[PDB]
């Protein structure tokens, strides 16, 4: 779900950036309410995420080549030998059905090599399950002697916003998703709107990203009146302030001049102490899934020489306790923890 | 001293506008804890019917299966609940889905080409190019296919765009619509927006008559501040119409001559429906859920 | 891609108002603001939903591996 | 009166890709040192 920025420099159109949207316009409230948002952590609305807000997909392509001059491995299934329930993922040709759900261990293709006289399969292996988007058979680098050996398989990996995923405004204010807060528990505006994203007010005094502050009252003004605003640098002056410009626009529409909104608590239901700073800010979802190195090991495999847990997250590997952690365990005088 | 009968004496309801989709009603002399409870229930706890299990047979469209399945779930169905029983999750799929627990909606669209003189319109250039919510055909099955005879399953908003196609592409699916609550997923929330706003209070400390009264009148929306004459003071005609912009406080001539507060007891509720139930039915069920929640705890053994 | 079903913030159905919005801008020759008002979008959250929609699906559809040329 | 976004213009161009000169010349002007550099390898004066 790509969206055109309300607040934008006019050069965005000059480069036709609308052909490739990079973000979405979100209702962002500068509020410290949940308690889970603080400095590097921001809150995303549950009901917003449930409605497809910031949803993304990731496509991965694999090349299954049979080269390792006489042809031995052939795409498909060998006669007489056939291990149980493989036909659920692959078609008669040995290639997978485009659209099929696959998990690590599932067969991604099938072939038969005469050297071993057995029907083998190339397994799909990744922590993230996928669906087959595209299967292309390529039989090139031959004049008359044609036979397929090379196949390109595209995987569609669905990626909903998870706790840990980074999100950022166009002002360098990145933060990890601390929690997907429910709309009932979310603070609700006088208008009846609950913010899509919650940014903590303690982020701004150190970063000094005032561009985001003016973007908030500009985005709100442009959403109400239905007009895009120019946010090209040095357009405004010390005499002609944007906070006054969009402030006048906000007052004319029927909202508070200083970009504030009277909000009520989602828990107690009572009106909050003061009016909360709410607006429309163009937010970007960063591609990284930070919890990629998430692992747990009780008793996994060990190296033959050292008889110590082997290195490798996916291999059920061990976490290294290095010299500094050794030093720290000596430090506490905690000899049994070191042991 | 607070009695439940003493509450009946002061508690008032005022209906401003009651449309087929949205109802604007007031809850006078009630606590925040009760008004917020109904609000929370109307969004999260009032059960509704929405597509949950989309079974795809073919999808050659540009829109991915996951995305297309999610869009069908988001489409509100003009289905009254209570007609459906709650599905049990522990027993298997063959026992799980029945004529009392599930509603089936099928989508079978194939795009082709049409001869027309050529910018040219997609409805002219291609046949079945745009897939709408109205294209979800209701299929009644089992023991009861006569209970939904005078009540056909149709999406609340039919003109909702579900998919866009080009000749050669096709969509074939069987969607299983079930009963769920808004707390689980936003697709099950029967309300578009159930929110309350406290009655704005404008405490005029000084008479502020004259030309300053005309200046004070422009600080609030048109139908809020009313002036009798040049004198006879400056009164508040309809404090309910106020937007609470605090525009009056950003002026030196009024910053100390007026106070802006609220009526903590008075709540202005605005409830819009997705299309399945009427906004009154949604509020009534919310009060019925709060009562049932307190009733379930009343007739319950206090363990340990 | 296509117009989202329901407003991300509140949940007001917006998916049935995309084609109707372009008709209010083309045939009726109205401004962006007045067009959204006639569709029944008064909250700025519902306002930006359609106003800010790109509709890349029309660009995406022009690549069809099922029909020649 | 404003520095608005092209909505009607955008959607029409999405359906109708121009048959004349491509829109956004600055985008082609961005890759001008790359294409131009390789163009001068065969085309231009002195062969």
């Amino acid at each position: 779900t790509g969206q055109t920025p309300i607040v934008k420099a006019n050069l965005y159109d000059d480069y036709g950036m609308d052909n490739f949207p990079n973000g979405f316009n979100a209702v962002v409230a500068v509020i410290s309410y949940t308690g889970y948002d603080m400095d590097d952590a921001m809150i995303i609305n549950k009901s917003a995420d449930e409605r497809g807000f910031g949803y993304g997909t990731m496509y991965k392509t694999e090349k299954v080549d049979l080269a390792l001059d006489p042809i031995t491995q052939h795409f498909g299934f060998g006669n007489d030998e056939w291990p149980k329930e493989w036909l659920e993922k692959l078609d008669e040709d040995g290639l997978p059905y485009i659209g099929t759900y696959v998990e690590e261990g599932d067969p991604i293709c099938a072939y038969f090599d005469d050297t071993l006289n057995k029907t083998k399969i190339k397994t799909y292996h990744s922590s993230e399950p996928a669906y087959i988007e595209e299967v292309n058979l390529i039989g090139d680098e031959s004049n008359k002697f044609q036979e397929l050996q090379t196949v390109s398989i595209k995987y569609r990996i669905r990626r909903t916003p998870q706790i840990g995923d980074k999100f950022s405004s166009r002002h360098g204010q990145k933060g990890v998703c601390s929690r997907k807060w429910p709309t009932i528990d979310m603070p609700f505006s006088e208008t009846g709107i609950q913010p899509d994203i919650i940014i903590n007010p303690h982020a701004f005094p150190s970063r000094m990203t005032i561009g985001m502050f003016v973007e908030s009252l500009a985005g709100k003004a442009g959403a109400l009146h239905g007009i895009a605003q120019d946010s090209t640098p040095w357009i405004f002056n010390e005499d002609d302030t944007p906070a006054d410009y969009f402030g006048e626009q906000l007052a004319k529409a029927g909202y508070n001049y200083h970009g504030n909104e009277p909000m009520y608590s989602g828990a107690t239901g009572e009106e909050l102490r003061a009016d909360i700073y709410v607006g429309v800010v163009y937010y970007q979802r960063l591609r990284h899934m930070v919890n990629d190195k998430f692992q747990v090991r009780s008793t996994g495999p060990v190296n033959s020489l050292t008889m110590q847990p082997v290195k490798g997250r996916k291999r059920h590997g061990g976490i290294r306790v290095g010299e500094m952690e050794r030093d720290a365990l000596i430090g506490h005088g905690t000899s049994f923890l070191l042991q | 001293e607070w009695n439940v009968e003493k509450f009946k004496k002061d508690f008032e309801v005022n209906i401003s506008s009651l449309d087929a989709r949205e109802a604007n009603f007031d809850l006078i002399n009630i606590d925040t804890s009760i008004a917020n409870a109904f609000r929370r229930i109307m969004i999260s706890e009032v059960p509704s019917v929405a597509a949950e299990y989309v079974y795809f047979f073919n999808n050659t469209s540009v829109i991915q299966d996951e995305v297309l399945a999610h869009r069908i779930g988001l489409v509100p169905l003009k289905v009254d609940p209570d007609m459906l029983t709650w599905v049990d999750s522990n027993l298997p799929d063959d026992e799980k889905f029945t004529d009392e627990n599930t509603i089936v909606l099928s989508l079978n669209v194939k795009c082709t080409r049409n001869p027309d003189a050529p910018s040219t319109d997609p409805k002219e250039l291609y046949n079945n190019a745009h897939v709408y919510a109205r294209d979800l055909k209701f299929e009644p099955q089992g023991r009861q296919s006569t209970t939904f005879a005078d009540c056909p399953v149709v999406p609340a908003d039919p003109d909702i765009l579900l998919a866009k196609l080009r000749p050669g592409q096709e969509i074939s699916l069987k969607a299983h619509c079930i009963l769920g609550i808004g707390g689980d997923h936003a697709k099950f929330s029967p309300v578009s927006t159930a929110s309350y706003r406290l009655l704005p209070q404008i405490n005029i400390l000084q008479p502020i008559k004259g030309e300053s009264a005309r200046r004070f009148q422009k600080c609030f929306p048109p139908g809020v501040i009313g002036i009798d004459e040049g004198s006879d003071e400056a009164y508040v005609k309809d404090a309910r119409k106020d937007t609470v912009s605090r525009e009056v406080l950003r002026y030196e001539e009024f910053a100390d001559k007026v106070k802006l507060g609220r009526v903590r007891n008075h709540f202005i509720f605005n409830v819009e429906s997705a299309g399945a139930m009427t906004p009154e039915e949604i509020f009534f069920k919310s009060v019925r859920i709060l009562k049932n929640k307190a009733e379930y705890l009343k007739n319950c053994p206090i363990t340990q | 891609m296509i117009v989202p079903v329901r407003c991300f913030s509140c949940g007001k159905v917006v998916g049935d108002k995309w084609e109707s919005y372009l008709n209010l801008l083309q045939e009726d020759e109205l401004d962006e603001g007045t067009a959204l008002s006639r569709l029944g979008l008064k909250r700025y959250c519902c306002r930006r939903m359609i106003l800010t929609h790109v509709d890349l699906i029309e660009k995406f559809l022009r690549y069809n591996p099922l029909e020649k040329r | 009166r404003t520095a608005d976004f092209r909505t009607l213009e955008r959607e029409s161009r999405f359906i109708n890709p121009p048959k004349d000169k491509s829109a956004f010349p600055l985008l082609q002007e961005a890759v001008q040192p790359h294409i131009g550099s390789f163009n001068a390898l065969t085309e231009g004066p002195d062969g």
């Binding site: 009846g192 009146h225 357009i235 410009y245 529409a253 029927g254 | 929306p221 048109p222 | - | 404003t2």
Partner: peptide, 24 residues
């Protein structure tokens, strides 16, 4: 230096919950 041009004919487009654009 020329000031940023203000937008032509900006009206009220936000009111109370149960109140429409009836008041002009």
């Amino acid at each position: 230096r020329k000031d940023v041009p203000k937008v032509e004919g900006l009206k009220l487009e936000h009111f109370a919950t149960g109140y429409d654009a009836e008041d002009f």
